[PDB]
Amino acid sequence: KTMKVTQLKSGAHRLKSHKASLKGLGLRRINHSVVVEDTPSTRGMVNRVNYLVKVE
C-alpha cells in the first residue's frame, strides 16, 4: 500500500537530515504531492519532518 505526502512549508532552511528526509520521500517544493509506499521506513521520514509535510 501507498500514501500521499504533501509539503506545506519550505524545506530550504531546515537541518541537513530534515532536508534529506524531504528528498528521501521525493518532495521537491511547497505543495508538491508524491505517492510513496507506506512502510515504517518511509513513515519515519514523515516523522522526521512532520511539521513540514502532511499525509492525506
Partner RNA sequence: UGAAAUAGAACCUGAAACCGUGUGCGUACAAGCAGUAGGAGCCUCAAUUUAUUGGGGUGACUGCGUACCUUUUGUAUAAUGGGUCAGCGACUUAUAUUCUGUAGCAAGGUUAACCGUUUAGGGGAGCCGUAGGGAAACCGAGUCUUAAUAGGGCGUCUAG
Partner RNA sequence: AACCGAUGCAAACUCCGAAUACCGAUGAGUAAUAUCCGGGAGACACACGGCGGGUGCUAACGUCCGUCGUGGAGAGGGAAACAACCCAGACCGCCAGCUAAGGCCCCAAAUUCCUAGUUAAGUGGGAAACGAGGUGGGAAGGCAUAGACAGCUAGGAGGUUGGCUUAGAAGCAGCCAUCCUUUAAAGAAAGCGUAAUAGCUCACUAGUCGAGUCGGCCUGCGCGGAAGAUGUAACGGGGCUCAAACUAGGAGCCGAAGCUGCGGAUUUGAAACUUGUUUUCAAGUGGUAGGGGAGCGUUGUGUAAGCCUGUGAAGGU
Partner RNA sequence: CCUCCUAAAGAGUAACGGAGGAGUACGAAGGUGCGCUCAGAACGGUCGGAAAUCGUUCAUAGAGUAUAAAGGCAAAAGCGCGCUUAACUGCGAGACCCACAAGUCGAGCAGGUACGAAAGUAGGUCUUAGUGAUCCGGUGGUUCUGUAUGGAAGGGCCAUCGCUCAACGGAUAAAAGGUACUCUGGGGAUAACAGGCUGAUACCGCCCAAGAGUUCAUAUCGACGGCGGUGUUUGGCACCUCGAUGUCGGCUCAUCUCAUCCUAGGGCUGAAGCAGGUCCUAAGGGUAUGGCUGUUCGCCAUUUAAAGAGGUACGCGAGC
Partner RNA sequence: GCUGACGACCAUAGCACGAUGGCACCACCUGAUCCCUUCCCGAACUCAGAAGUGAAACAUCGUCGCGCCAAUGGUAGUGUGGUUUCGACCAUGUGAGAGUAGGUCAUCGUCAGCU
- Which residues in the 17-46 window bind RNA by CB under 7 A? 17-18, 23-26, 28-32, 36-37, 39, 41-42, 45
For RNA, the closer of residues 16 and 56 by Cβ is 16
Taking CB under 7 A as the rule, does residue 15 contact RNA? yes
* Helix 40-48 with 16-25: angle, nearest 10 deg: 140
Q: Is the dihedral of CA 43, 45, 48, 53 positive or negative?
A: negative
What does the binding site for RNA look like in residue numbers (CB under 7 A)? 9-10, 12-18, 23-26, 28-32, 36-37, 39, 41-42, 45, 48, 51
